[PDB]
Design a binder for this molecule. Sequence first.
Ligand code: A9E
Ligand code: A9E
Ligand code: CA
Ligand code: CA
Lengths: 204, 204
Amino acid sequence: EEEDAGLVAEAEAVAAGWMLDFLCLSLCRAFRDGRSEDFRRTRNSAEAIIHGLSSLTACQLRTIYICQFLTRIAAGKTLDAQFENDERITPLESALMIWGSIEKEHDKLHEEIQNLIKIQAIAVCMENGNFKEAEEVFERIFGMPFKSKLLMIISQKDTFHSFFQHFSYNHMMEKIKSYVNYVLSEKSSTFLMKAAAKVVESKR
Amino acid sequence: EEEDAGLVAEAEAVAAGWMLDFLCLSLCRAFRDGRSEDFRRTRNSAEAIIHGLSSLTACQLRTIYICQFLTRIAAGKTLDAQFENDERITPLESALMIWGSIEKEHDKLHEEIQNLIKIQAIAVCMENGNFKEAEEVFERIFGMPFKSKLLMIISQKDTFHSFFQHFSYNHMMEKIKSYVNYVLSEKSSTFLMKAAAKVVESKR
Ligand SMILES: CCc1ccc(OCC(=O)N2CCCCC2)cc1
Ligand SMILES: CCc1ccc(OCC(=O)N2CCCCC2)cc1
Ligand SMILES: [Ca+2]
Ligand SMILES: [Ca+2]
């Protein structure tokens, strides 16, 4: 009776792990495709499954970090969203913290995404007329030539500066989608998706 | 590209169906065991997965009805919970509506559970001092000898009447748990649980 209960709990943990990988893959695909409503609904399912998991492997923590990173990027222009206990941290600042914590290679693409999130974290404040908040985000992030241009734009209150058009929100999204394509290729072979794909193929 | 997107969506529907059955089995087990917090967390996961499913088979609708029925029974004493668009309907009345909609045999146990939910739907109002609400629940449900005793208890404001101790909330819960055991036996062979169980067994 107690051994049965324990074996059932172990099986529920195995199934939750399979469900987390599948939901991460669905979330990545919705982000890549721009399917806003599917992303919202999948994020809700991923959060609920995560609250039912206790012990995590290094791989499951990385998968969770990727889900959290994409959620903050999707909410990057929503300055009323509070993702951290410190209410001053903006969504792109929260995405930057996660980006620097994921156990992943620090290749050229990693650094390009990092710097585009930093510029846009300031740009989104400027675009909403939040000039003092842009200065505070700048101080938290920066924590020389790149830093100096940003402080100049902030002090001029140059909301639609040409610098923000060369390192735009769309360019940040496109670089992030390139990274998402690599996660989709790596997780396409996860148990639930493979089994579901085999079922669909066998009926064709 | 469009055929690939369509095949991916079909696989996501297959996986969501497997996830719904697994979450129903986990929800049933938490209800049977009295694991209140696991029931709450599993209900959250089941609701989110359900919102990501569009077309349902007759079997999936029955599985969803069972999840909804157990949620209303678990909230039976929570008279501030509103499960229907009509705010007057109490949680046990909402459970009674679902019980009469499930495609299932109407054996002796089905009717015993039905009548215990009817008595308790009135009993829970009386126990909270809501005498006028008990009369209104009575009129919505009833909709001869059984009906007459209840109307007499309601009019006397006999909160802790002996009739409610013979057909108690605990007796209703125990009869419902007997039914839950049959659902657990029928869904223990679902894809995700079987595969998870095989993994756990292979490591023993
Ligand atoms: C957006 C997806 C999401 C993910 C997790 C979460 O809460 C849990 C949480 O933060 N951790 C921290 C990381 C390890 C798991 C527990 C809420 C929402
Ligand atoms: C408690 C579990 C739960 C289940 C379903 C749900 O909403 C969806 C809903 O009602 N239907 C009606 C029945 C068919 C699916 C759509 C909310 C919570
Ligand atoms: Ca804010
Ligand atoms: Ca009420």
